[PDB]
Every structure is written in C-alpha cells, then in structure tokens.
RNA sequence: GGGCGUUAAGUUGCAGGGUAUAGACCCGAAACCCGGUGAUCUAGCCAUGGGCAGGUUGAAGGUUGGGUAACACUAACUGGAGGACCGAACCGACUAAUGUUGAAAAAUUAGCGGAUGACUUGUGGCUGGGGGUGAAAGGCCAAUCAAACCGGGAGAUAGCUGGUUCUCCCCGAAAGCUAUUUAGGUAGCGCCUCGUGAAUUCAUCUCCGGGGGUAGAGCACUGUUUCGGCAAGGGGGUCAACCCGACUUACCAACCCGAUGCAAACUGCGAAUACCGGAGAAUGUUAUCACGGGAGACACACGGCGGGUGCUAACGUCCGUC
RNA sequence: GUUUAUUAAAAACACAGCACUGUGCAAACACGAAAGUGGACGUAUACGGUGUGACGCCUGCCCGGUGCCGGAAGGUUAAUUGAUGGGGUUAGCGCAAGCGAAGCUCUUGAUCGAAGCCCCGGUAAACGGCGGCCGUAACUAUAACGGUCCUAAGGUAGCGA
RNA sequence: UUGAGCCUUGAUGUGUAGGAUAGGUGGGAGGCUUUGAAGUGUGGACGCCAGUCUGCAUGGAGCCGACCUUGAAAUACCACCCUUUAAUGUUUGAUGUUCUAACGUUGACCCGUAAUCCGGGUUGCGGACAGUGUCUGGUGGGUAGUUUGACUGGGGCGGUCUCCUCCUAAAGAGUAACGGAGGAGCACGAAGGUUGGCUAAUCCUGGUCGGACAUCAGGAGGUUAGUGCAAUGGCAUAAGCCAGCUUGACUGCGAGCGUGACGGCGCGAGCAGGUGCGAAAGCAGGUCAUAGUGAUCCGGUGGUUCUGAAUGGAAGGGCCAUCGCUCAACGGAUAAAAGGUACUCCGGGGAUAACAGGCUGAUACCGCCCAAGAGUUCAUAUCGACGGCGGUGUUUGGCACCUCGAUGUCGGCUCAUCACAUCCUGGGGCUGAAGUAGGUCCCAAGGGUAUGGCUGUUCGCCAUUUAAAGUGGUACGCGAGCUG
RNA sequence: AAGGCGGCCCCCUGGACGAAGACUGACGCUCAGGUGCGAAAGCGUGGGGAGCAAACAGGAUUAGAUACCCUGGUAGUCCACGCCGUAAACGAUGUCGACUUGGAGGUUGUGCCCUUGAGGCGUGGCUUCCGGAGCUAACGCGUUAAGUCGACCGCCUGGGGAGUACGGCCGCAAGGUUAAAACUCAAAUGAAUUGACGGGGGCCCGCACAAGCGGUGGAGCAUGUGGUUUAAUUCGAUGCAA
RNA sequence: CUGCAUGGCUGUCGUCAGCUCGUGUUGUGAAAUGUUGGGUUAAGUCCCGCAACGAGCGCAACCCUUAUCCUUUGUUGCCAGCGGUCCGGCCGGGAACUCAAAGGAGACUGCCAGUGAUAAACUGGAGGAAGGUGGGGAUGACGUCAAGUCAUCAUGGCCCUUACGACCAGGGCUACACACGUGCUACAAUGGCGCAUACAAAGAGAAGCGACCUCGCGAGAGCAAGCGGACCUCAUAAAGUGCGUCGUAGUCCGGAUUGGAGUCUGCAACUCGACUCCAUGAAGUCGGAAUCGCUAGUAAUCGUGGAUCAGAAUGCCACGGUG
RNA sequence: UGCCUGGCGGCCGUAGCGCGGUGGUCCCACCUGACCCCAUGCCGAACUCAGAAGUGAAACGCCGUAGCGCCGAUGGUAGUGUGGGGUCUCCCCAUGCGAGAGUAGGGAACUGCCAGGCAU
RNA sequence: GGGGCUGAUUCUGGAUUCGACGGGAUUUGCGAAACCCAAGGUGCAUGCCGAGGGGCGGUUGGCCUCGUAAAAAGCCGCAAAAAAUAGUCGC
C-alpha cells in the first residue's frame, strides 16, 4: 500500500496507547527521498519547546546533490502538523520523567506525508520479560487445554 | 458556353538520322544451373604382406624362506608389461642460417620430437562435390577449395574501367531546377544544332507610369543598454560606538520625463541598382517566338561584388550576378 | 598423440573418467523417391547424440523467459459433410410494370471435426540468470546490526589487478 | 451406449373480477349415453392448493351445459390442435468387446534349389491395426530463393525524409547548407450564409462580504485587445463580439489569369435550374488568407440514357457518386524481408577516409605592449593578475587539393646534415652580484653533448657519471641499408 | 567380552550351567608394544528407495526467528564389498582369587519327599530391590562392596590456553592417534545445609475472582500532584504503602 | 543541609500466622527434630501418631461498646393509680415502668441425637435476647522496604556570625495553552416544585451557645431572659408522608458562568471566605478500553452534630432515618 | 450677391489635439411623455413614434491662441550603377542618382453640389 | 565526447498538508503617533549655561533636577553566572 518506513523496534520497546496521525512539514529533497529515496524513521522522538514539536530523530538518504548552492544535511529537525485541539495533551502529559512521544510509522495520504506519533512510557528488561512470559503462557495454556480436551 | 475536329494530299520504293525486339560499338568479371571426369597427391575405411639397429628401468605372476589357525604381510631367485627412457632406419617439421627470377612453384645446412604402437609402409578396392572425408584447421578432395575439373546455357549481367582508326567547312553549350532505394545513373525542363513559318518580334539608348522596404537612417512598435530628475527606500553607518539612528554607507533600486547607442527574424521613414509595361529615333546577317529531327549535359573552379557557415582562417564549404 | 600439405604445432581437437537424454529390436539414428544396408549377425553392463575432460574437495539458489515431458477440465481451430437466407432462368399468372410453383445454377454458411495453440505442473551435469541505497560500536576508521524499493535469486564453496 | 422425422400431441391455460384449466374465424349445445358417463379412493403430480391430466384396484352407468364474478360463453361439441410435455418398432455417428477372409510377418516347415535373395504351399501371431495414395492444421535455417534505403564536409552512430510561417534571400519572381526560430497529419450543422446591433487590452477613483484578483458606477487610453491554433501579412465598412432566419458547406458549366518539366494546384467575372437572408440595392459555389495531406493498380457500396461474344436475360465491364493504404523512406519497387564475414572475392575512386605532402593557424611553443602588485620602502635584479598585439610551423585541430592500375606507416642499430628560440665551453650588461657559488638578458652554431633496470618503445621513473647528457625539421630521416 | 541382538522356518557355528563318573597334572592370572572386534554419524563403488528425515523451498509467531510449529523435500536411513575408529562406547566402578551378618524376589537346572494346587526341605549359575558391620567429604557402596587383602596394566598432579599448534603415524577425504610451550588468574571444583526463585507439583485462606449493587473514566463544579510562567508559586510525601 | 550517623514516632507485608529459645537426640561439620504427618480450625486452636520433652514472642481470653434480666438511688429524667384544672406532666403526688449509671446473673459445644479414630472436632435441635468468637472496637511478633520525617522535638559532625541570623510594608502559595488522583452536583416524571405533618441519636456552649418581640422577600439587625449546662439554647431533622402541578420536552431538568445592589465575622475579603435577592440558564440527556468497595442493619440514598476556627468542607471524624 | 446652419463628396497628419468664449431669428442637439408598432437577452442607456415649455448646460459649430502633434527647404552627410585604384575584414578618384534625422521656415485647412433661414 | 529513459503518484492542465507556523484583507476597544486641540484646575515652567549617572560606564542631553549649578534617575550594558536539555541505560 502507501506504507513507508515504520519503526517496529520502538513498537516492541513501548506499549503506546496514543495514536495521532499528524503530518510533517518538509523541504524539497525531503519529499523527493520520501517518495523514493529511503527516509528512515528509526530513533524518533519529539522536541516540544514552544509550539514547535520538531521530529528531532529522523534520517534520510538524499536523492542527489542537485541543490549545490546551499548544502543541506539529513539531520534536520522536521516540524509537525497537528491540531491545537490535541496539541494540549503534548503540552501536558509529556513531562513525567519517564514519558516520551515517539513516531511509529510514516505513510502517504493524497500526496501528503503523515507520520503517526504516540505517547509511551518505556519498558525496562524486567517487564519485557513478563510480557514475553505472558505471551508464551497464553499459547501454552491454550495448547494444554486442547491436549486435555482431545 | 467549354474540349476535339471541320482549311491541308496521301501512299509506295530508294538513301539517310533516330526508336523498339532481337547480343546490338568492342574487350573484362567475381557468380548460378545442367550433364559428365577424378580417392594414383591428400582425408577416412576395408583386405593382404613388410619395417622398428643397439643400450636401460624391474609390475602382475611363479617358486624358496619367515610369518598367519588360514589368510594378509615380509626376505631371496626367475619375470620382461608399459600408449615406459636414450638412441639408429623410418615418420614429422619446433629453432636459426642459406635462398626468395633459388639446386627446389616450401628445399638445404646445424640442432629437434616420436621411434613396440592412437606407429609407419607396399599393393588393390570403397566413400562424388551443396557432396565425400575430416583426433575439427573451414583443413584435404590430383601444385587450384567458405563449395574440385571439362563442356553447355553463354557473346549471362556489368548504372562500372579502358579503347573507338581518313579530311575540310559552318554553328556551338552545361556541370543548373524538378523527381528518383536517387546523389558518379536516368527522365522532363533550363542550355545547343538543323529545318519550316511568323508578327517592329528581340536587344541598346531617351522619355513616362507603378510596385518596393535592401543599403543608409531612426527608436513611433517589438527586444537590449548607459548616465540624470521624480521618487519607496534598503545594505557596514562617520556615529551612539546598547540608541530612535544624526545620516549616504566607492552598492542596488517600478512607472513617469530629458538625452546616448545596438538589431537578419524592429521599421513613424527611405535611395542607387534590379524588374514589368507604354511612346520614339539609330544600330544589330530575326539576333525573338512556335513546331518538328538530332544531341550533348545535371562532378565545375577562381576572381570582383552582398552574404550564411568557419576563427570576416584556408588554393575550405554553401547561395545570387558578371 | 593430432591439427591448418606451402608464414600460426599451441592454452587449439582427441583422450580414459563423469553426467544427461533417446533407444524392447522390424530399436533409435544415417545413407537411400524405394528395395536395401550400416548400427549388428550386437540386445539396456549394448548403441547413438549432447556437455566436461586423468586424479583429491564439490556442482550451492532460481522455471520470471525459450526449449523438453506429463494432462486434456475449459477457449480457438484445418481438411470433411452441407440447415437456411439471397440472386439468375422461366411453364404459368398478368389488357402493363410486376409476381412467378418444379428443374439447373452463383453466393453466405447451420452442425461434426483431430493435432496444434491458449492453460496447469515438473525439468538447469537444458538454453540461462544470480542488487544497488543509508544510518548505527568506549577518539579516528569500518560496519556485527537495522530500516526498505525490486527481483527468480541477488554469486554459496573456492580463487583473485 | 447411442441423433433428429417417426405408433400419440398422455397435452397445455387462468383480468385484483373468479363452481375459472374458457366455446379458434363460419356453426353459439351429446358426436357422449352398448364413439362403455359423476361413482369409493387419497402412487405421480401442473401447483397464484380456488384448484388441477386428477391417473388409476371391485362399479357395468351421467360429469357436465346454462355460466355464477360476467370487460371474454366451457375443451361435455364440428375443433389445418396452442404460453407446450412423453415411450417403443423407421433411420445409423462415435467410445468399446469378439472373429478372420483383406493386409503385414527381418516366427517355423517344405519346394523351385545345389541358394540366409525371391516366389509358391502348409502352419502360428497381429488384425481391420499398422502402412501406403490425395487434401489438410502444426512443427520445420535440415535445405533453397531473397531483403537489410538515401542525405552525410570519408563510413557507422547521432538527426532528417511530407506541408506551412519569419530571416539569411542582395527593395519584382525564384534562390542552398547537418543554418538560425516555431508549427501542421485538426476542429466546427456551427466556429458557415444573410440581416440588425455592438466596440477592447491596461490603469486610476468610489463601493457589503470581495482579497495584487470577479460582479458594479465614473474616468485616463485608443486596438498597446481579439483572430479555434505556430508565425507572417491584414481586419473599424470591421475579418473582432452578440441576436433573428436558414443550409450556397447547392448542381452543370465557365471568358480570363497565376504557379509548376510534368502529374498537378489555386483565383475567378459571368450563364442555366432551384434556394437562404435582406423592404430593397445586394450577398452566399464554406470558415481573414497561407499547414490539416497520398498518384496508380486492385477491389466494396447505390444509380445508370450503356456494353450483354447465336437469341432473351443474367454474370462481368464501362459511366456517375463514394469507400478500403503513420504506402510518414510521404511522386508511393512487392500484398509479403533482419545481420556477420579478420575465410572473402569482382568492377571501380584519391569523385572518398586512415600514415604522409599542401593550404590556414583555433589550439601548441615563443616574443613583445600598458601596469594592480609580490619583492623589508622600491614595477621592472626576478616575476606579474585584469587585457592586447605578433612570429614559427612545432603538438592537438579544419579542407579533401597529388597519390587506392600501390607513396610500407611505430620503435630499435648504423649513418648525418641544417636551423639558433644555446646545455656546456667563449665574450659582455644588470643584479635584491661582498667572495665561492647564483637569477635574468644580448652576441656567438667552432666543437662536444651518457651508461644500465622497467615496458615493443617514442615519453617517463629510478641508480651512477659528466660541462651537458639542449629543442626542432629532414615522407613525425633513413626496411631497393637490417630485424619485427 | 563390549558394541549389540525381537515374526516364523531351514543350514553351519560360538558361548554358558547342572546331576554322577575317570585322567592331564600348575599346563595358572595380568599385560607395555602388537593384532582383532567395535553404536551411530561419515566416505568409495554397484543397486535399491515405501515411510521418516539433515541441506533446501513456502506458510506462520515474534521488533528481528537463517529455530521451535505447519506443507513439501535431497543426501542419509536399506542391500553387498570396501574406508575412519569416534560416543555420556556409563555401573562415569580395568581382569582374577578367597575371606565378611540378612530379608524380599526374577530367570534357569538338579536330589528327595503321599507332587491331592505354581506341596516342602537342600544345592548350583545369572540378575533386581532393601539393609547390618565396615568404607566414603557426603551422596551413597554394602557377598555382583565403593568392607579387609593379594598379582598385573593404564591414568591423575590448579582452572583457562587445549586434548590446541608443531612434529611422527593412520586415513581418498572428513578426521583420528602421540602431544606441548609462551601468557593470565586467584581460584576453578563435587556432596550436603538454610533461604529465595520456577512459565514445577500438592493443599489452604482473604470481596481475589465467579453471582450481584452502586459508582469512577463523560461536562462544568471543591481539592492535591507533575510541567509550564513569574521574584516567589516556600519545603517535605513521589508505586501498592504519594 | 546530612532520616545513606541517629533517638523518638509512623506506614507496608498483616490481625497473615507464623517467628524463636532451654535441654535432649541425630549428622565430624553448615544444620535437622521439636515447628513435619492424620483429622480439625477463624487460626503453631486441640487431639492422635512420632526423639522428643517444655517454654517465650505469637492466636484466643482478660480490656471498651451493644444485644436480656435482677438489685441498689429517682432530678434537670417517667406518668401504672388518684384530684383538680388554664387540658398543658400543669403539680400535688406516685418510685413499677422509658431512662439515668454502679454491681451482678446471663452463651460456657453447656446438653440431646447423628457423624469420627472408643478422641479432637463437625451437623442438626429442647431451652434462651442470644450458638459456636452472639455483633463491632482497641490490642499489629520475630523482621523486610538505607521505607517517611534532622521543617513537631532532641541529637554527632559540616556550614554564617556586618549574615543561611534579627524587625516591618506589599505580593505568592488560590497562577494564562494541559494531564493525573480522590469527592460533590447531577442525567430527571423513583423526580424538583407550592402549601399542612411525624419519626432519632450523639456532641458544643462563658469576652460562648444564644430564647422571645419588632423590622425584615434575606443572610441578619435593636431588644435581649435562661445557660459552666438531663433545666436553656445550637436544633419544627430530611428521606417520607397528604393534595394538586409539571407528561418525556433548549423540560417547572442541571445552578456552572456572568451583571446589579447588600447582609454577618475580621485594623482590612481586588489579588483571596461564606451566606441573601433579582436575572442570566455552560454542559448534560447514563459515559470507550480498563477499573473501585461492599456478604447484613453491611452497599446505596437522606439529614445532623463535633475537631482546629474572628470567618471559611463538596474534606476529616461520629451519630442516626430508610434500607 | 455676402452671414452663418444642414446634407453629399473631393482632398484624408500644414486636414489632428490642448487653452480662451461666443452662436438660437433659422437648422441640430438637449428634452416632454409614451396604451399604440417597435425596443431592452433589466431599465425609452440606443431605434422609434406623438411635440416644441425651456436651454445652448453637455454636445455640434465658429473665431484667436506656437503649448503639442505635423509639413518640412538650401547646404552638408551616409549609400551606390559604371570605369579606374590603395595600405583591401575596409577605404580613394572621375561620374550621375543623391537619402533619414536635425536647422531656417510654414501652419490654427481649402474646395463641389443642392436644401432652407438671413440683409439685399 | 555525443544519443535514449527518469526528474509524474501522476502521466488525464485545476491536491484547501484538516492541523501549528509567515502573510493578506472584513467585523471590535483606544494611547498626540490609531487621533486633531489650551481650558476646567489656576502653578511658578517652555527654553535659555545644564552635573555625569544604580555596584560600574553610557542614549538624541534632557526622560531627574534646580536657582544661577550638583547629587545625577525614569532605560541600556556588568548583569540570571536555573542554558545545560526525550526513552532505555553500570558500580
Ligand atoms: Mg554471374
Ligand atoms: Mg544466389
Ligand atoms: Mg614408447
Ligand atoms: Mg617421451
Ligand atoms: Mg634436418
Ligand atoms: Mg632424430
Ligand atoms: Mg626416443
Ligand atoms: Mg575396400
Ligand atoms: Mg569445416
Ligand atoms: Mg575461423
Ligand atoms: Mg560445388
Ligand atoms: Mg554455389
Ligand atoms: Mg541465356
Ligand atoms: Mg562476357
Ligand atoms: Mg563562333
Ligand atoms: Mg553511379
Ligand atoms: Mg533553323
Ligand atoms: Mg533582388
Ligand atoms: Mg529542337
Ligand atoms: Mg529536343
Ligand atoms: Mg540535377
Ligand atoms: Mg546526378
Ligand atoms: Mg566531371
Ligand atoms: Mg557551383
Ligand atoms: Mg562567385
Ligand atoms: Mg566574399
Ligand atoms: Mg577564401
Ligand atoms: Mg570541393
Ligand atoms: Mg606431445
Ligand atoms: Mg610451423
Ligand atoms: Mg537391418
Ligand atoms: Mg574443453
Ligand atoms: Mg573433473
Ligand atoms: Mg550448476
Ligand atoms: Mg512452471
Ligand atoms: Mg504438450
Ligand atoms: Mg486439441
Ligand atoms: Mg550444466
Ligand atoms: Mg587467499
Ligand atoms: Mg548351387
Ligand atoms: Mg485375435
Ligand atoms: Mg537460418
Ligand atoms: Mg526453418
Ligand atoms: Mg538462408
Ligand atoms: Mg549512403
Ligand atoms: Mg525577393
Ligand atoms: Mg454587419
Ligand atoms: Mg425575400
Ligand atoms: Mg485561419
Ligand atoms: Mg501497385
Ligand atoms: Mg448473350
Ligand atoms: Mg452491372
Ligand atoms: Mg487501398
Ligand atoms: Mg523512397
Ligand atoms: Mg579489388
Ligand atoms: Mg581530383
Ligand atoms: Mg593528412
Ligand atoms: Mg603527395
Ligand atoms: Mg608595493
Ligand atoms: Mg638532428
Ligand atoms: Mg642568439
Ligand atoms: Mg658545424
Ligand atoms: Mg676558425
Ligand atoms: Mg629527428
Ligand atoms: Mg625508395
Ligand atoms: Mg549351541
Ligand atoms: Mg595395548
Ligand atoms: Mg551407518
Ligand atoms: Mg516428511
Ligand atoms: Mg519437517
Ligand atoms: Mg552409502
Ligand atoms: Mg574417547
Ligand atoms: Mg568411560
Ligand atoms: Mg585379558
Ligand atoms: Mg549375562
Ligand atoms: Mg543398600
Ligand atoms: Mg587433534
Ligand atoms: Mg506464564
Ligand atoms: Mg457650450
Ligand atoms: Mg541636399
Ligand atoms: Mg531630407
Ligand atoms: Mg528635417
């Protein structure tokens, strides 16, 4: 479909409950590479300062060096396109010393790039172990039930 | 009304210039097909007989001894197998020299490889040319092979190359346009010659009418460009040195006006020459036009003039006039 | 060993070994319009063809495409056979144009109709093909790793200006 | 097992009207009852379950028939029989099981015979198979006949092949290049004809959204807008924009003229017939004009005042209108076509290339001119930016002028000449020249001006000497002096 | 003997035990080298190949899953002759001799008793479980000793480096065998004890679920916390237990 | 400032039921028995069996409240009986009762059957207000969380003595875009509205609670008697009950926001309390994942008192009504 | 015959704009209202059909203004057809034709038909 | 050194990035700079030489002054020398 580079390592590391389909504001070469040219969404987080929740973590492979007059770099703070109705939640519940906002996926909608973002906490090894334990234990319990029922 | 006719004599022989089919001015192909001849050279195969001097290496195997229950294994004697080794005859030609109208249309000289086998050789036969054969090189098939030789079609074709032989007199060009599987050929026209007819037909000069829009010139229009005024003012301010910024900071800056230039694809204007028509004398062997017979030719070059292209470079190239 | 007699004797051909394929005999194949012959007076441990070429380690992935084989569920489909439509002719109807039954004709072609092709699968020791792009590790430097466009796969073992 | 004529239609039905399974037109009514009627039941059933062929066990004798709801009169009747159903005798096209007499036998025996060919006889096998003859679909470089264009500042590649607009095009017409610039392979029954009416682009002011922008009112300006399209030439009488009517976007001609070698193309007053608009005078044979396109042959369609192979028709042909070709290589070879040859060959060319020679010198080398400066101040002792003018032919370049009826080109060995823009030696000037030793410039060609490793070298790197191991032309010297 | 051996039948053959009988007369045990056998996997030749199944293909879970799972699938597993000689080749216990309390069996002989039942009393061979003395660090062994001895062979001397490299041998190969050194470390270890944990098992309790009831999360209202802003938003509490 | 030096105090596991010691025994020894196993339970409660025998902290009981009865003593608490009435406990009087607060009796598996191991213990029941702890509260082990407080207080170092110390005025803890937590109002016809009308308990009161009269639509204001309080006040409790009214509605539903003018306490409510009138009438119209408490007078629903307090609860702590 | 007005033409940039103010006794324009018969893709903005209350206010026309637009000499220059030359990417001479722009200057139009209204 | 394909999520001529962040214009209160003024109050100033300024220095020299010139204080610099910055992550 229209799905482009998505971060699933963050999806595993977090248990995000927030889903905003906010868009992104980009320059020319950015959308050039996003259409084809491998914009990378790995290691993504927001940098809310004023009303300026830049997507700080995002890489990209430039299409070419056609724009030779001015030298650009892949490491740019891409801005965000989100409603002020929902921007208050980020103005609020982001500073909890243990809460972050990360980008899950990036896709196309009528030739406009929309990057999904979500609020998460962060999982440390001892709860990932419990999550995997429960995931495998549900399967084991269902298998045991089927074997007992025959 | 328009096209073709209605004026107008043709025909048969002779000779001559053409045209069409027959070879069609002559010499010359590489090539195709058909019918025959070759395996005595060479390539393969079959059948029958010869050749490999001489000198080395010790595998299988067979005995004796040790050893094993029997083997297996081990020591001694015989053994002479190898697409085995060196090297003669024989076969071949890897290197260098000689020679290149030579001794010889592939050899000689001094070296070289195989030399008991996938070897070599004598005799006879078999394999036929779009086929044969080929330890595979497009190699050989009788000094000739990416399709052998003889004869026939056949004097194939050749828009190609060369040649085309006695004399005199008169006239006398082109290397241009169009079309072309066309560009070095050809066909029509432009140009030439001969004959028949025809009008002051044609040419030079003088006068008259008309078209220009090229030189030159100019910026009314389409583009380009410079310095001034009207201005919005910005950019390092001298100065505060943090100021509103006092202010012009070797900067840029819409229209509007005043000047200065450029243009093949600009012309509010605009020549000479070039070209057509009307009138007139003088001169020119009708030099002008129409038809018919016959061609030749469509590879041009230089200089002068106005130019594109090139470097206003070329004995360079492309156009128009002499 | 053989090879271009007569400028190339070699890395060029052959070779034993190995792989695939067809071949049940009146075998495949080849020469022959045919008879017939070779294969072979042989019988799948044999013959022919195609690849590589003693021997040691191996022949890794892919049938997208072209060949080959297996199947005929569906579509198309020759030759063959001939259901209708139309036209010609006229015995006769028509005071006239015009109708016009049989017989003979030219034409369209209803239906039947195999192989083949379309389709499914296998076959690579069949013809063949086997990726680029970016970031990321305690200074430099690289990338174990990940993100993702495409393919049939992205080149394994081994070797390397 | 099996296809339609075939013994029979055993048969179907229905306005929401409904004893409803309606009488073919002409006759509306027993032909039924000995042309065997409703009777009891409850397979199968059409099924709008109101019903319905209701079919069929023992009967031995009446259902209907008026039509009730009626827009249609019972199928209980004479019924070329329907919105449609069925089994067996008539016909034999396939897939099969079985037999031998065709056919085959490179199974066995015997004979001709003395004979592994052949033929005949006997006996077995396969068997209407295989195979062969004609047609036919597929496969089919195993083999054959062929094609693969031109222009081109040598060929190939790149680009072009037709038409139109501007300039080169030198003030009539025409006029070339692989010159500079753009388009065309259409659209429109209105975007045409007539009549009537009308005149923008741009800018300024005022005004509700409304804005650098619309729709309005006034003004500046006069074609700086517009043409269905690219460009040129025009358009105010408007060719530019609307409204009403219409099809002249007609038929057959056509004096004359322009442009082309020709095939051809275009303009055109006016005549005859019939139309449209306008009261009328008058206009209309397409579009403001120039691109919007393709010969011939072969065939298709409709009419024909024709032709009709003895007659009468017909078939066919001709005539008129018209259709089927990115034949774009566009004056179009045929309906039907790609490459390699270093295994090549033939006829030619220096008309046409590569090595050379000639011409010019963009480039190459060298010289000179003015001066921002570098150089502790200081432009010249050395250099010199931004710019310019020249010499040689000397590299890379352009032309194709001699040579393709033959001029052998790279490099290496031997053999040298000449130039001076001189490497050294020789003679001098300046110096940012103290001396030794250096930088630059002038004159001066008398002489000299390496050895080895690398690669086939020229060039170059390296090692070691010398005063240097200098630059060029000599067909980038020299193969009728040598190799390769 | 070990590895190992499972329908039935036949052919050849090795080994073990017992009833009674006679001789042979120390011929007896172990074993460095050496030889032979030797699970499976593996390699060569010639076959076979139903099922299973490395490698491999596809699907699936997962952030990733080159695995566990699913659908296919080659070598292999099978036969004959050959090659290596590796295993947790384990009883982690080298062969033999005799001595040292018992119980419950299993298998297989043999003597005698009234064999009325797999009735009893003795004696042998193999083997299982429990256990006394004894032994061991403990677990545990315990007449088949890990109890006390005798004869012989092999091996061990800290964990890594390493049973690694080199070297000799064997082998077609994979690899096997003999076997170090430099360097680092203060430990590396085994039996058991007490906690703790288990996606180990068993039992039990609590509004912890199951059957309710009402609320919270939805929209203002009264509070505290985090961040924001300010000169301060004074400080502390920051899971259930703020 | 250091609760990462502490004393003291407190939360959690958990009102879970375990945590230990003396002697003896077993194993060289860390250690084990006792504390496991069988019934039983609210429970290491009890019994049985057993290298165990006993004890301590512990799960129970003793402690506080309430559920029945008896007795002692009746004012400010009550009227069985009588008299009168101003019909009112009014007071003479009556000390049985409702009640006041002291001591006892009383529930102890005591008994009766069944079950079990001849036990412990369990099931049912004649009695009782009561049945297995009758119903609630206090009582919180060994110990874990460097758990929270050095800002209640004390305390060891460290830090300042012209300043981190001392005094005063004005602002801030109550704050512009949000999130989270605990409660309240609610959503409506089970309801709000207008007018009558009963049913409680527990507490407070001395510069304090504050009767009555009058002005007040009102918070309240002048007047104030009584009360150190079974006397007098705070303080006609609400839900309900009677009657109409509202008919599923931007509602006579929700009273959040906002404007006008005041009432009480406080030198002084703009930052920053509350009550009262008029009007305005935000949402909402039963709430997504995921969640919280409760097993009987408990969950819900209604009202009141009290703590610090000049005033300020929708919070906290307790009584009750219905249930 | 002279004033001015109307219609049709010739001449179409000395023939056209800007400024000053006049014209009505005539002719024209403005205008009145409008059922007709005609008209607006809405309105008598335009066509018109019935007329003269007023005005020359806008137009139209006339007279002067040199601010403009234009017409533009002589002379000079550029160019060149022929012939002859140099130092030849360009130029000289003998010859005729001789521009464009810019100076001097001109300039506020002439003229033919009828149709009326004016003095004669 | 020269040709062809891409520079299109659309090839087919008309995307509101739905949102925050520039810019426009429309509907609201005001401050002589979003206004143009000396009239109520009836005080001692406009300007005239102005002194160097919070701890330090300074602005058109007057925002702060007055008597015949001096402290200067309404702002700007030193200064606030909380700008040290998601989640995961050792002793
Ligand atoms: Mg020929
Ligand atoms: Mg040929
Ligand atoms: Mg030999
Ligand atoms: Mg040899
Ligand atoms: Mg020789
Ligand atoms: Mg020899
Ligand atoms: Mg030899
Ligand atoms: Mg022969
Ligand atoms: Mg060949
Ligand atoms: Mg060849
Ligand atoms: Mg031949
Ligand atoms: Mg030939
Ligand atoms: Mg011939
Ligand atoms: Mg000839
Ligand atoms: Mg002559
Ligand atoms: Mg030619
Ligand atoms: Mg003549
Ligand atoms: Mg000309
Ligand atoms: Mg002629
Ligand atoms: Mg002629
Ligand atoms: Mg020509
Ligand atoms: Mg020609
Ligand atoms: Mg020629
Ligand atoms: Mg020429
Ligand atoms: Mg010329
Ligand atoms: Mg020239
Ligand atoms: Mg020239
Ligand atoms: Mg030429
Ligand atoms: Mg050899
Ligand atoms: Mg040779
Ligand atoms: Mg044969
Ligand atoms: Mg090979
Ligand atoms: Mg090999
Ligand atoms: Mg392969
Ligand atoms: Mg396939
Ligand atoms: Mg097939
Ligand atoms: Mg078929
Ligand atoms: Mg292969
Ligand atoms: Mg290597
Ligand atoms: Mg004979
Ligand atoms: Mg048969
Ligand atoms: Mg071929
Ligand atoms: Mg073929
Ligand atoms: Mg061919
Ligand atoms: Mg050509
Ligand atoms: Mg011309
Ligand atoms: Mg008109
Ligand atoms: Mg008419
Ligand atoms: Mg046109
Ligand atoms: Mg033709
Ligand atoms: Mg006829
Ligand atoms: Mg016909
Ligand atoms: Mg055609
Ligand atoms: Mg052509
Ligand atoms: Mg030749
Ligand atoms: Mg020539
Ligand atoms: Mg040359
Ligand atoms: Mg020459
Ligand atoms: Mg200087
Ligand atoms: Mg020389
Ligand atoms: Mg010199
Ligand atoms: Mg000399
Ligand atoms: Mg001399
Ligand atoms: Mg030389
Ligand atoms: Mg010579
Ligand atoms: Mg036996
Ligand atoms: Mg041994
Ligand atoms: Mg095995
Ligand atoms: Mg399987
Ligand atoms: Mg599997
Ligand atoms: Mg095997
Ligand atoms: Mg071992
Ligand atoms: Mg072992
Ligand atoms: Mg032994
Ligand atoms: Mg045994
Ligand atoms: Mg034991
Ligand atoms: Mg090893
Ligand atoms: Mg689990
Ligand atoms: Mg006027
Ligand atoms: Mg003049
Ligand atoms: Mg002039
Ligand atoms: Mg002039």
Model resolution, angstroms: 3.2
What's the DSSP call for residue A107? E
Question: Measured in angstroms, what separates residue A23's CA from nucleotide D67's C1'?
Answer: 86
Nearest Cα residue to A22 out of A58, A55, A49: A55
By the 8 A CB rule, do A10 and A115 touch?
Answer: no
**Other C-beta atoms lying within 10 Å of the C-beta of residue A74:** 14
Question: Measured in angstroms, what separates residue A129's CA from nucleotide D274's C1'?
Answer: 105
The rounded radius of gyration (Å) of the Cα atoms in chain A is 19
Positive or negative torsion for Cα A137, A142, A143, A148: positive
By the 8 A CB rule, do A20 and A80 touch?
Answer: no
Please state, in angstroms and rounded to a whole number, the distance separating the CA atoms of residues A89 and A17: 13
Q: Write out the H or E segment, with its range, that includes residue A59.
A: strand A59-60
Task: Check if residue A1 sits with its Cβ under 7 angstroms from strand H.
Answer: no
Please state, in angstroms and rounded to a whole number, the distance separating the CA atoms of residues A84 and A80: 11
Burial of A149 (0-12, 13-18, 19+ CB in 10 A): exposed
Structure tokens at A73: 């770099």
* Chain F bases having any atom below 7 Å from a protein CB: 177-180
CA neighbours closer than 13 Å in the CB half-sphere of residue A129: 3
A34 forms beta bridges with none
Question: How many residues are listed for chain A in this entry?
Answer: 150
What's the DSSP call for residue A136? H
């Amino acid at each position: 479909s229209a799905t482009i580079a998505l971060n699933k390592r963050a999806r595993h590391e977090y248990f995000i409950e927030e889903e905003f389909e906010a868009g992104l504001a980009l320059q020319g070469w950015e959308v050039k590479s996003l259409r084809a040219g491998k914009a990378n969404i790995s290691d993504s987080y927001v940098l809310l300062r004023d009303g300026e929740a830049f997507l700080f973590g995002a890489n990209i492979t430039p299409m070419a060096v056609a724009s030779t007059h001015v030298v650009c770099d892949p490491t740019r703070t891409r801005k965000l396109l989100l409603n002020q109705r929902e921007l208050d939640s980020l103005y609020g519940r982001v500073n909890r010393e243990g809460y972050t906002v990360v980008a899950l996926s990036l896709y196309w909608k009528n030739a406009w790039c929309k990057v999904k973002i979500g609020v998460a906490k962060g999982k440390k090894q001892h709860d990932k172990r419990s999550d995997i334990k429960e995931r495998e234990w549900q399967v084991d319990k269902a298998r045991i039930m089927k074997n007992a029922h025959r």
